[PDB]
């Protein structure tokens, strides 16, 4: 029984060494000398092995991603099976096809991972029993089944999330035990030695929110590593946490690390000045600063010590990520005015404060900044913490973005975060023009929920024109059919072939409408002119062929 687990550990398995570690860790050394150590060393190798390839990107030996997602009686899906790619998966379809529901189900699945990492025996989010159940289904329960991949030793991590409507005879339940096991391995090896936890994030529609800038949310917690999991699957990027963390980094960079720690010891010396002035009478500030020293001792020791890298390097890395992914903003830095601490960026050469940034350049910075924050806080043992593993669920990456800026958004995101499995659900063809054919899942525009598969489009979308992607993949005309001014070339050809290619009474006046509408330099009039010449000299060929024949 022990021998089978040791043979499985020799053959390669993360879970097989875990119960061995749990059964030999509770006794004394001598009986545990090198016994616990070899399984700890092998487990930490299986988490932390990685190599630098020929392109310079750190690639882990045991990548973590989601393989398959199965939705049974979930919202509008009868029984839907989706196979997800390793690096990027795009789900496209009309308004009404459940492509936000897919991200919602994956986020509900990842909530168990996040909660069980954060607290031992924790509980993640659960499916609702009012809206997520299919109102047409007669089984009155819905289950969401996912499979996770964590290397060759861990081929499958199953998880099911079940929910039954009220009134059922049998209470259907979840089977989140393998997610519990994997997050237990990560948490109990992280509590004793530092590792690189993965990033789980969901960027839903509710990132499109105004900035308040008067935000005095609870000061003190926004520098601890497990704060990076705080409301990370909520749907909205925690730009509040990012800007509080960035003011923390600016103050610590300009004061705490340039000329050592000073802002605490100056008021320590103030207390040593005022401690023997007679009657003391200062008990309100006698103790509220004394634990600030304890805070800076037991929280900054991780960030300065060998587990978490240098804070100035953290600032440089998050600034580099922001100016690399975010299109026109090229630098981000903080001003300290009398009574205020405000962050300003260089947008198109103009120093613009965050609150008056544009709504299409601020809700993408709210994504990139928060994502880069969570990677640099959760993956500190890397030269580039943006190369850490994780799963990120972006909903409508093309939100509030110009078509000029949609041509590089997913290229910039995949360049900055190579090891993140992005799962995006876009509407625009221009985003699809930068994404491979195999990375696209699609919904046909007749999709009442019965499909057991989502398949890629037939034509390649990586270099195709936007009109071709719109008119072959998304099933939309290039010129609108609800406009009588768009069918004028077709009516021109009908009225011109009615009278054998002569501009007699109808084709000439309709040509005048085309010329007066589209313009002299218009490509539509260019086709019209070319077809006029080609079809006026066609009667010459008709006469020549008639003379040859008879």
């Amino acid at each position: 029984m022990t021998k089978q687990y040791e043979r499985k550990a020799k053959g390669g398995n993360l879970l097989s060494a875990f119960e061995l570690y749990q059964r030999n860790s509770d006794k004394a050394p001598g009986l545990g000398e090198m016994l616990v150590g070899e399984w700890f060393e092998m487990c930490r190798d299986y988490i932390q092995d990685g190599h630098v390839d020929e392109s310079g990107i750190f690639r882990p030996d045991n990548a973590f991603y989601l393989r398959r997602l199965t939705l049974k009686d979930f919202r509008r899906f009868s029984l839907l099976e989706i196979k997800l790619e390793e690096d990027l998966t795009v789900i496209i379809g009309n308004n009404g096809k459940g492509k936000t529901s897919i991200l919602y189900a994956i986020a509900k699945t990842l909530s168990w991972f996040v909660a069980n990492i954060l607290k031992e025996g924790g509980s993640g989010q659960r499916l609702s029993e009012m809206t997520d159940i299919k109102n047409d289904a007669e089984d009155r329960y819905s289950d969401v089944s996912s499979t996770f991949f964590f290397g060759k030793g861990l081929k499958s991590v199953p998880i099911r999330l079940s929910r039954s409507a009220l009134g059922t005879a049998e209470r259907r339940d979840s089977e989140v035990k393998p997610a519990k096991d994997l997050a237990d391995i990560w948490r109990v090896i992280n509590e004793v030695n530092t590792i690189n936890l993965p990033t789980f994030a969901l960027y839903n529609v509710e990132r499109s929110q105004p900035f308040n800038r008067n935000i005095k949310d609870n000061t003190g917690r926004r520098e601890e590593r497990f704060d990076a999991y705080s409301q990370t699957l909520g749907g909205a990027g925690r730009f509040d946490h990012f800007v509080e963390w960035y003011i923390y980094l600016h103050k610590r960079t300009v004061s705490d690390i340039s000329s050592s720690i000073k802002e605490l010891e100056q008021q320590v010396n103030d207390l040593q000045r005022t401690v023997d002035g007679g009657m003391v009478s200062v008990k309100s500030l006698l103790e509220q600063m004394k634990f600030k020293l304890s805070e800076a001792i037991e929280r900054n020791d991780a960030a300065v010590s060998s587990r978490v890298l240098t804070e100035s390097v953290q600032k440089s890395i998050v600034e580099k990520a922001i100016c690399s992914v975010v299109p026109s903003i090229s630098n981000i830095w903080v001003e300290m005015i009398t009574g205020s601490d405000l962050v300003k960026v260089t947008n198109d050469g103009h120093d613009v404060t965050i609150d008056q940034l544009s709504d299409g350049l601020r809700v993408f910075l709210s994504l990139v900044a928060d994502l880069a924050r969570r990677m640099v806080m959760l993956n500190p043992l890397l030269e580039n913490p943006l190369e850490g593993r994780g799963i990120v669920l972006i909903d409508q990456i093309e939100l509030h973005l110009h078509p000029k800026w949609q041509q590089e958004v997913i290229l910039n995101l995949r360049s900055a975060f190579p090891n993140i499995q992005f799962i995006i659900t876009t509407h625009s063809p221009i985003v699809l023009s930068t994404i491979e054919k195999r990375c696209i899942r699609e919904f046909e525009p007749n999709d009442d929920g019965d499909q057991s598969f989502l398949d890629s489009p037939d034509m390649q979308t990586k270099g195709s024109e936007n009109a071709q992607i719109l008119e072959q993949v998304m099933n939309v005309h290039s010129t609108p059919p609800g406009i009588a001014e768009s069918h004028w070339l077709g009516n021109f050809e009908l009225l011109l072939l009615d009278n054998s290619g002569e501009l007699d009474n109808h084709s000439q006046v309709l040509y005048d409408q085309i010329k007066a509408h589209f313009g002299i330099d218009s490509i539509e009039l260019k086709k019209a002119d070319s077809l006029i010449r080609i079809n006026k000299m066609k009667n010459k060929l008709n006469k020549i062929r008639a003379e040859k024949g008879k």
């Binding site: 046909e444 007749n446 999709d447 019965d450 499909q451 057991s452 598969f453 037939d458 071709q468 008119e471 072959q472 099933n475 939309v476 005309h477 290039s478 070339l489 077709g490 050809e493 009908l494 072939l497 009615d498 086709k527 070319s530 077809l531 010449r533 080609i534 000299m537 066609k538 010459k540 060929l541 008709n542 020549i544 040859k548």
Partner: protein, 211 residues
């Protein structure tokens, strides 16, 4: 669409007789090399490349049960029935969408010529042919209405860009009519009639090239 040369009845379907068994009993692989020789591996309804394909019955099996095993009813279909819903053109659309239609209200590419009843324009849109009135005009409307040529986006846009991709070719080849002589300039059009059959769209480019 195209004249399909109905060459010879295969000997696979001679043993099985309609009424005793349905269409599902025969294996589907013994008729496709017989059909692809005369079709070129093409749906002859959307005039249409077969990346995925199945066998389509020109007249429906449920209405005329003793017509399926005649071999005059078998053609190729743009797409396959295994899509959980299928496409909206060629063979699937007649059996799934559209509505009521008559057997004599349809054009059959085996003997009837589609050149003088329907007309492929340069914009990818099909119209009825000029001078056509009455029952044949109603037939020319009805075939397009049940086969969705004026219709689904992936067919209409692809036909439009295939015809529009050769417009400079047609323009510059036609503008040298006075420069070149009779036989060596009609040699260009026989070169086109030897060119176009290795493409998806044949009669649309025929209508774009000559008339």
């Amino acid at each position: 669409m195209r004249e399909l040369a109905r060459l010879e009845r295969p000997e696979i379907l001679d043993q099985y007789i309609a009424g005793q068994n349905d269409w599902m009993e025969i294996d589907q692989s013994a008729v496709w090399p017989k059909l692809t020789e005369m079709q070129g591996g093409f749906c002859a309804y959307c005039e249409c490349r077969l990346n995925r394909c199945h066998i389509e019955h020109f007249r429906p099996r449920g209405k005329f049960p003793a017509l399926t095993f005649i071999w005059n009813n078998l053609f190729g279909s743009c797409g396959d029935s295994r899509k959980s819903g299928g496409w909206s053109r060629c063979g699937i659309y007649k059996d799934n969408g559209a509505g009521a239609y008559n057997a004599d209200d349809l054009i059959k590419p085996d003997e009837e010529n589609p050149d003088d009843y329907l007309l492929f324009l340069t914009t990818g849109e099909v119209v009825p042919a000029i001078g056509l009135t009455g029952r044949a005009l109603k037939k020319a409307q009805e075939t397009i209405r049940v086969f969705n040529l004026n219709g689904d986006i992936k067919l209409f846009g692809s036909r439009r860009t295939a015809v529009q991709a050769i417009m400079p070719n047609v323009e510059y080849l036609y503008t040298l009519l006075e420069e070149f002589d009779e036989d060596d300039w009609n040699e260009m059009l026989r070169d086109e009639l030897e060119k176009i059959e290795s493409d998806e769209y044949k009669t649309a480019l025929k209508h774009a090239w000559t008339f």
